[PDB]
């Protein structure tokens, strides 16, 4: 009979993530970690330390890739009328999708766990001003990291900047990217070939017959610098406007000035490129 089953998740140290899992493709059979303000180590099968290969996990529908070292739980050999303890250490590696929301000071993993660090926290170009809720020694930004695929065993040639965070329960690793060209507070919604702009009553009316929509804006423009994290609006607007002009009005119209930006009731940002016919 089971008198108790203590199940815990321990983080994999940095020196084991880089030197063991990423370099050799194996994982240690002993878990040494800090729990309840004490250094605890568990030996798999109550045996000596050994490197175990990380084999692919059993396939499940609509699940990400995963690797593990052990597949059976170790239980003590039978000895009559005694309480016996058995230790099992299963080194698990899971690719997950992580999501963050504005102001991007923290992110969650697909397993429902929270990481209280900004996804853009790092050491370069103002990444050290991002939010972090952990000690400085729980985070490590490795540069010149060569990721090793655990199935194909093919090292990536291009080095990447890899953040590694050792939370009390696990160790997350993710590729560092700059915040400004990655996130945006606005997303492109519609691309309209023909919005007629009409000036009346001290207001602009942008009417599109294709989608049957009329937007009302103030006469003055909307300053793009006023948009928080608004580095995508300009790029998307220029790209879409150029594409549509090349598609339809390349042989008939010409652009008149740089694209303007207006704010329309309901909170819609209109990037408008006025056009004038060859006449």
């Amino acid at each position: 009979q089971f008198m108790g089953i203590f199940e815990d998740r321990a983080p994999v140290p940095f020196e084991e993530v880089i030197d063991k899992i990423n370099a050799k493709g194996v994982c240690r059979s002993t878990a040494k970690y800090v729990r309840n303000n004490m250094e605890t180590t568990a030996f798999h099968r109550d045996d000596h330390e050994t490197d175990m290969e990380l084999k692919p996990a059993k396939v499940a529908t609509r699940t990400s890739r995963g690797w593990h070292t052990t597949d059976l739980k170790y239980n003590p050999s039978r000895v009559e009328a005694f309480h016996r303890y058995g230790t099992t250490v299963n080194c698990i590696v899971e690719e997950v999708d992580a999501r963050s929301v504005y102001p991007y000071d923290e992110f969650v993993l697909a397993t429902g766990d929270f990481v209280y660090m900004s996804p853009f926290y790092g050491y370069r170009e103002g990444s050290h001003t991002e939010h972090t809720s952990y000690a400085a020694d729980r985070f490590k930004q490795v540069d010149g990291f060569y990721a090793r695929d655990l199935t194909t065993k093919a090292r990536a040639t291009s080095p990447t900047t890899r953040n590694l965070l050792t939370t009390p329960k696990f160790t997350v690793a993710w590729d560092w990217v700059p915040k400004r060209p990655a996130v945006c507070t606005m997303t492109k919604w519609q691309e309209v070939d023909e919005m007629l702009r009409a000036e009346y009553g001290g207001s602009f009316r942008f009417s599109s017959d294709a989608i049957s929509t009329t937007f009302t804006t103030n006469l003055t423009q909307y300053s793009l610098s006023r948009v928080d994290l608004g580095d995508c609006i300009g790029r998307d607007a220029r790209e879409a406007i150029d594409r549509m002009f090349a598609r339809k009005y390349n042989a008939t119209h010409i652009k008149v000035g740089q694209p303007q930006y207006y704010l329309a009731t309901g909170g819609f940002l209109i990037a408008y490129q006025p056009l004038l016919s060859n006449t």
Partner: antibody
Amino acid sequence: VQLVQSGAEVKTPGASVRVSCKASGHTFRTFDINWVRQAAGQGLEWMGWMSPNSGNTGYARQFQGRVTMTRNISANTAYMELRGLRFDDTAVYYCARGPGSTGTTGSMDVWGQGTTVTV
Amino acid sequence: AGLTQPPSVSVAPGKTARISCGGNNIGSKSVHWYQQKPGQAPVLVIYYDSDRPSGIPERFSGSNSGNTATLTISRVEAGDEADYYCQVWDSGSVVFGGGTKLTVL
């Protein structure tokens, strides 16, 4: 990232040499700096490693007590300083991004041009 | 805490060159193979015992098992004449191999 070292140095026995290695392109706190020297016509001889993020260093057993490894984060530079020079210290010194704090199994993928030191 | 390498290896241009690196339980370490032409900094040609950096031709290959690591250069060109070093991390230091001077006949 690119590593650029100082010029050649000509010294006398018993003097001290500070070799500078400046990193360009990265914050330089995200990797380690390994100093390794090669004599005239001999093989590579590792000298030490330094973690510019924290300042932690690790030297070879044969270079303990004669090598001081320091850094200037503001100027993005790492310095290796040898004391008590002798005749066999005439060598080409290279700074590289290699093993250390970021991981003991790392590779010396990027190198400096190397400085020639003659006593 | 030392790696044993042959001082010199001579191979005809048409054939393949094998460079060995011996050590106690080197199969548990990542052997990185560096190539050095005269008057140049070493250039990494193999890392993590089996992998080639960007821009490195398919000719180079590596293996590491038991007490021996091996670098194999297939179709040895005349420009492959260089000094090759095997590097692992032992205790708290990286030990460098003695160096093998590959001679192309």
